Design a protein around this ligand. Structure first.
Ligand SMILES: [Ca+2]
Ligand SMILES: [Ca+2]
Ligand SMILES: [Ca+2]
Ligand SMILES: [Ca+2]
Length: 395
């Protein structure tokens, strides 16, 4: 190596979100180690080793904003890989925008955003909850049954459920419940009683709980008899193979997810991701969509740097649009709206905590940041390649 570049990593390693975010740091570090082993990042004929600073967001959104300022100003990083909850991202967004910096954010979310200073590898709703909703209503064993929505009390679950309510109405179904718990809250018995009352003949439960309150939720719904055997099916948007392995797959068997990457994808690229992750971190370790999303961020950033011949975040962000990567999920591409074109999978959870893949799109789906079911965003798009279009413009 001729020089070094130091990037920022900002995730919850402690608190209620650690169950989800800790493995993202592991995965981002694996990508960095791979890139370094292959020669680093090439800029102006010089090979740069990638170093990193990890900051603990501690499941606390003001801390995410504070550590973002530290990484940008004190540490002079050219990108921060970070975030999970939309609460943490909304807290960080003014920091990256006011400092004209660059956050790369990997987690599935609600859309309704298109920051010039954020790029996104997590699913937008049309890459996750919209196909999942149609699947539950039309194809699942609870086809035609009513929907009950349960999530954490912040902007992702509330916005996701607003979209779901619009879509279920358009599909001709019914929503019979919508309830939120504060993030981390484990007092799930009252909502369980409501689900039993509202779905006396079984049905679909849409779960947007984030973090480790999912542990209490899945264990208590099983003890209450809200089980696939009794006609109750949960579709979850914010947990996958990692959290399932901590919870215990016996509590998730038979329930559903919708994701762009699943560990069970039967391709050399998917198997190599899993095998490499186990070799570095242990044979017990899972890979999953959040990790695949974060992995991709590092490789996409590296490609954009080499295309731009610069680490400057304005030049890298300009170069990043259009970049393609042969990812563990299949081919992905960074779009003019800064999001990622991705293949969509529907899965049913097995006794071992893997997904049985039941549906898969014919190639990747372009991300709709501005949601096309929600009346306020219908007809809008985002395109940062055209000065006359931009963050939010009418088609
Ligand atoms: Ca920890
Ligand atoms: Ca993704
Ligand atoms: Ca199959
Ligand atoms: Ca858009």
């Amino acid at each position: 190596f001729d020089d070094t570049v130091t990037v920022g990593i900002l995730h919850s390693l402690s608190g209620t979100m650690a169950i989800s975010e800790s493995t993202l740091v592991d995965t981002e570090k694996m990508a960095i180690e791979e890139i370094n082993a292959a020669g680093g990042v090439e800029v102006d004929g010089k090979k740069y080793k990638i170093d990193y600073i990890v900051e603990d967001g501690a499941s606390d959104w003001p801390t995410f904003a504070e550590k973002s300022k530290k990484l940008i100003d004190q540490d002079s990083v050219p990108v921060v890989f970070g975030g999970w909850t939309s609460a943490s991202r909304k807290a960080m967004l003014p920091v990256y925008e006011s400092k004209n910096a660059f956050l790369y954010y990997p987690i599935q979310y609600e859309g309704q955003e298109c920051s010039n200073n954020i790029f996104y590898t997590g699913a937008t709703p049309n890459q996750q909850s919209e196909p999942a909703t149609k699947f539950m209503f039309e194809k699942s064993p609870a086809a035609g049954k009513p929907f009950f929505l349960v999530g954490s009390d912040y902007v992702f679950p509330r916005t996701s459920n607003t979209i779901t309510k619009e879509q279920v109405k358009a599909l001709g179904g019914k929503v019979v419940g919508e309830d939120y718990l504060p993030l981390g809250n484990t007092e799930v018995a009252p909502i369980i009683a409501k689900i039993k009352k509202a779905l006396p003949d079984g049905g679909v439960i849409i779960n947007t709980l984030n973090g480790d309150q999912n542990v209490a939720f899945f264990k208590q719904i099983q003890d209450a008899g809200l089980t696939p055997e009794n006609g109750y099916y949960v579709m979850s948007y914010s947990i996958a193979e990692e959290e399932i392995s901590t919870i215990g797959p016996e509590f998730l068997e038979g329930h559903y997810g919708a994701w762009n990457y699943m560990m069970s994808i039967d391709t050399p690229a998917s198997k190599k991701f899993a095998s490499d992750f186990k070799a570095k971190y242990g044979n017990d370790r899972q890979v999953a969509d959040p990790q695949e999303s974060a992995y991709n961020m590092v490789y996409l950033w590296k490609a954009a740097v080499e295309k731009a011949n610069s680490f400057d975040d304005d030049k890298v962000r300009e170069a990043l649009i259009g970049i393609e990567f042969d990812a563990p999920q299949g081919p992905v591409k960074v779009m003019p709206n800064h999001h990622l074109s991705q293949t969509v999978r529907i899965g049913k959870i097995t006794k071992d905590g893997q997904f049985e893949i039941l549906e898969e799109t014919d190639g990747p789906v372009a991300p709709q940041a501005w949601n096309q079911f929600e009346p306020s965003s219908k007809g809008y798009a985002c395109d940062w390649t055209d000065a006359n279009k931009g963050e939010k413009y009418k088609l």
